[PDB]
């Protein structure tokens, strides 16, 4: 049984998660545009820059975020952007979302200058997580939880973050006990994704440097979030 003080949190969070979506102007390109390593990379860039925007808006609305040291807020945004993006894309492929054009989107990612050493793990992650049959609420809570990770590098007050994250973890667990009483390991299975997600940050920074020396174009927003001269 979910409490009233908790059912309100989940509602506020589920509310912000569904507030903004990605522009049809952007998502229509996955379908309409030419399939070129160049065009592919540019569409992927456009989507990521845009999502960095939705991420800030979403995070800002997270309960207690705007109260943390402002230098800690940047560290949390800078540290979760890639992971939040893996979760959102995995959700897209997993729920075969219409505005996601999964097959074509996968095409564009499969040919954008990404090393095979990275694509394999990326899609394997997409597959295994899809097989979890996650509910929009699990995606939304794993995202908020990923965003409020106290153990990110350069965090000053790591205790203030834990205080913001623990309430969310509990709501997620309370749900796994309700909608999955048969399978008790479901909660622990969802948290395992937080570790797998971590794993991609090393790979991503490699890619950023690879694309960079190849004179690949990013955006002032992405360069800032991902510390790229």
């Amino acid at each position: 049984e979910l409490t009233p003080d908790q059912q309100t949190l989940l509602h506020f969070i589920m509310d912000s998660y569904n507030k903004q979506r990605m522009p049809q102007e952007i998502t229509n390109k996955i379908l309409k545009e030419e399939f070129s390593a160049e065009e592919n990379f540019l569409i992927l860039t456009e989507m990521a820059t845009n999502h960095v925007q939705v991420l800030v808006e979403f995070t800002k609305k997270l309960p207690g975020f705007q109260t943390l040291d402002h230098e800690d807020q940047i560290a949390l945004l800078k540290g979760s952007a890639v992971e939040a993006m893996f979760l959102r894309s995995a959700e897209i492929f997993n729920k075969k979302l219409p505005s996601g054009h999964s097959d074509l989107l996968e095409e564009r990612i499969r040919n954008s200058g990404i090393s095979d050493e990275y694509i394999t793990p990326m899609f394997s992650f997409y597959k295994s997580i899809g097989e979890l049959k996650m509910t929009q609420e699990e995606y939304a809570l794993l995202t908020a939880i990923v965003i409020l990770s106290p153990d990110r590098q350069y965090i000053k007050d790591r205790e203030a973050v834990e205080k913001l994250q623990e309430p969310l973890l509990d709501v997620l667990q309370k749900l796994c006990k309700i909608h999955q009483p048969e399978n008790p390991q479901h909660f622990a299975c969802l948290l395992g994704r937080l570790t797998e997600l971590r794993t991609f940050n090393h790979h991503h920074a490699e890619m950023l440097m690879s694309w960079r020396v190849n004179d690949h174009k990013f955006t002032p927003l992405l360069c800032e979030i991902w510390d790229v001269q």
Binding site: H70, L221, E224
Partner: peptide, 11 residues
């Protein structure tokens, strides 16, 4: 430092 993130956080 971090002009753009700082700006999005104040908007």
């Amino acid at each position: 430092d971090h002009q753009l993130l700082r700006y999005l956080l104040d908007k």
